Design a protein around this nucleic acid. Structure first.
Ligand SMILES: [Mg+2]
Ligand SMILES: [Mg+2]
Ligand SMILES: [Mg+2]
Ligand SMILES: [Mg+2]
Lengths: 107, 299, 120
RNA sequence: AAGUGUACUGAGUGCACUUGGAC
RNA sequence: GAUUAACCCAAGUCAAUAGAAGCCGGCGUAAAGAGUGUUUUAGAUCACCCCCCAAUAAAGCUAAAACUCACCUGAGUUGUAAAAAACUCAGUUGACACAAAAUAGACUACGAAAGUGGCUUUAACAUAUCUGACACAAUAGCUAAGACCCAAACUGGGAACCCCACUAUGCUUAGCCCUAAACCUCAACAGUUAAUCAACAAAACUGCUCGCCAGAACACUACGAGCCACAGCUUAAAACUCAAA
């Protein structure tokens, strides 16, 4: 644009950054509701464990449970951080292994 | 109750011998949802149309029905329906007269339900015919106020269940609504570019227009022929040109329809008033009812 | 009662503008008060009502319609409108509707409660 | 043939427009 | 998933979040030149050297061809792939429009744009010697009244597409609606041809100003608002999703 146009329009108005799945916080607490499996998008196919958890803000979200083996059950307390899974569309949270009811990865 | 597995689209292509013009709902879950919305079918007499592959048939049989009268047109699906009947010892049949089909309550519903997922090219004539049947208290409704659950295109269902002033108000809306309680309960889901709505019709105990079906149809069609003009523009055509002005004025005045009202701003009460006045006019003028303005203009 | 025995006699000899306070929600007694004539409902003080959700004006019009149905032909009520005399909201549209149609001919009787805003 | 706008009907048609097609 | 080996950092490591990275770039085809024209405050230096064709409105008029009506004849006419359906009507001659405007036109003009191609007359086609929001805006559509040859959404009949008849509508008046692939898809003005340049398109650029765009879809959408006078147009988002488009 012209110099006058730039002056009139002022500096760019950078849009506010959208709040991530964790609403801007690096972690949250939640209560597990229902565990289940999910099929990753092809070519990846290995079943992946997910759990519906009600965050500290009331919102319910599906969170991927990493690793092998767990004991998560209904009404159990977990801590969930951000980070989308590579091949689980929609799932945009991860249970932090080693906190609260999430007994360490049951190796 | 164990039933045969639903045919996949592979078996359907093999069955129709195409080796590669119809859409099949092969989703038993959606069929179960439709059967649920149809109501409680426990020990009910269900008349099923447009059977097709048979997902609706399987869902209804899963529902504890007493007799389920299937009517199919294509003979390539009869083998599957026969297998279904053998699995669930379903009366299959290949214009059909349902009145003689079943063994009749006075005008609650007489435990007789109708379920249909037909081609949209065939549902509209069928629903018009059944509306006339309700008007005459005959056909499938000899048993009483039989309830119907039919799948239409999304637009057609919206027009059927449209309210006064709703952009989808139209002839179908008025015709269905002055005889039936119509409820649009929509599917996006079919194995083979439109959405599908499910609509439930319950005949009204007291119809909102006590006039002949053909008379009401003529009145509504002439009213709605000009959907963007004042109602009188479309009403005036019911009369010969010679007496058009005076007859239209007399009609509107003997009714209480404001001439500025557009066609979609007319309620069933307005249509009742118009139909009554038009019936009086036809009674006192025999030639009026058969008049066709385009036929006159042909000269 | 005073209105029944003094003014209803004159009214029952035309159009009636029945003003109803939107905040406060006489309706069932209209058939005796005015008689069988054309009536238009005007919900006043709409501006003072907060906008709880979109389409609240439509919801209010609907609610007035069921209230009238509970009490009347839809005496016949031919129009339900929402106005705010203080802010002049909808007054011009009401005037246009009044002048646009044959049905609104004759005199106009403005009936309502004390606080309805009839003066305004 | 394709598409824009617009209106009726249930994807077509009517009017005008463009080649982001062929001769 | 386990095992071996290796790499980086190391009393740390690195998973999440947040921040630091932020406008002199573009607008024919990717988002982008807003349908068109004119102001003010201003801005810029480009200010100093400097007929007529087809615009528009009104009034009047008509050559060819239609329809209808007259006779005169004929019994079929129309319709197409071929038939149906339909009319008893058809041919010549004559009279005869409120419709449309061959040929010129292989011209490229007028108008801001949309548009403007029958004839005559009247009125008439702004301006500085720069750019820059109220007035217009094709076809379609609506209101009231007229015209209705022909064409024709829709309807009906015949065997969606084909044939037949006919209506909105196309036309006049008086008002509305304001959208088009409103496109030369290339903004106005001034200037240049000096060294070519994503590709294609209408060779490439410079200066100057205004408008417009900041991934896709959600979304010519919702909410609100304006115009409406209620079924629509203009303005126009958000959330959720994706690493594409
Ligand atoms: Mg200027
Ligand atoms: Mg402008
Ligand atoms: Mg226009
Ligand atoms: Mg016409």
């Amino acid at each position: 644009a012209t110099l006058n146009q730039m002056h009139r329009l002022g500096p760019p108005k950078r849009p506010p950054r959208k709040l991530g799945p964790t609403e801007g916080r690096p972690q949250l607490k939640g209560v597990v509701l229902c565990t289940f499996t999910r099929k990753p998008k092809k070519p990846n196919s290995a079943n992946r464990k997910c759990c519906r958890v009600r965050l500290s803000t009331g919102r319910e979200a599906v969170c991927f449970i990493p690793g092998e083996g767990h004991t998560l059950q209904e009404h159990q307390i977990v801590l969930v951080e951000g980070g989308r899974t590579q091949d689980l569309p929609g799932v945009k949270l991860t249970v932090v292994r080693g906190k609260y009811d999430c007994g360490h990865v049951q190796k | 109750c164990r039933l045969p597995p639903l045919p996949t689209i592979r078996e359907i292509i093999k069955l129709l011998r195409l080796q590669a013009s119809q859409n099949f709902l092969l989703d038993l879950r959606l069929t179960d949802k439709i059967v649920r919305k149809a109501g409680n079918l426990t020990n009910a007499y269900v008349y099923e149309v447009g059977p097709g592959p048979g997902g609706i048939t399987r869902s209804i049989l899963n529902a504890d029905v007493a007799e389920l009268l299937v009517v199919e047109k294509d003979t390539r699906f009869i083998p599957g329906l026969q297998m279904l009947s053998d699995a669930a010892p379903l009366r299959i049949v290949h214009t059909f007269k349902v009145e003689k089909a079943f063994s009749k309550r006075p005008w609650d519903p007489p435990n007789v339900h109708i379920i249909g997922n037909l081609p949209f090219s065939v549902s509209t004539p069928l629903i018009i015919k059944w509306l006339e049947n309700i008007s005459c208290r005959d056909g499938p409704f000899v048993y009483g106020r039989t309830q119907m659950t039919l799948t239409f295109q999304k637009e057609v269902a919206e027009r059927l269940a449209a309210n006064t002033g709703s952009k989808q108000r139209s002839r179908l809306s008025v015709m269905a609504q002055y005889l039936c309680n119509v409820r649009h309960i929509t599917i996006p889901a079919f194995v083979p570019e439109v959405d599908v709505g499910v609509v439930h019709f319950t005949p009204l105990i007291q119809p909102k227009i006590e006039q002949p079906f053909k008379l009401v149809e003529k009145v509504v069609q002439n009213v709605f022929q000009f959907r963007r003009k004042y109602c009188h523009r479309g009403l005036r055509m019911l009369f010969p040109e010679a007496q058009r002005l005076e007859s239209t004025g007399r009609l509107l005045e003997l009714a209480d329809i404001d001439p500025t009202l557009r066609p979609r701003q007319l309620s069933i009460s307005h249509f009742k008033s118009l139909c009554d006045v038009y019936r009086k006019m036809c009674d006192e003028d025999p030639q009026l009812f058969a008049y066709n303005f385009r036929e006159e203009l042909k000269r | 009662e005073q209105y029944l025995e003094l003014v209803s006699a004159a009214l029952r000899r035309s159009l009636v503008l029945y003003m109803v306070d939107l905040l406060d929600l006489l309706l069932p007694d209209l058939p005796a008060l005015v008689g069988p004539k054309q009536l238009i409902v005007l919900g006043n003080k709409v501006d003072l009502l907060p906008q709880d959700a979109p389409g609240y004006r439509q919801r209010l019009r609907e609610r007035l319609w069921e209230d009238c149905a509970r009490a009347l032909l839809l005496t016949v009520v031919r129009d339900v409108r929402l106005i705010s005399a203080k802010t002049g909201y909808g007054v011009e549209e009401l005037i246009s509707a009044l002048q646009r149609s044959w049905r609104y001919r004759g005199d106009v009787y403005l009936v309502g409660a004390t606080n309805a805003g009839k003066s305004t």
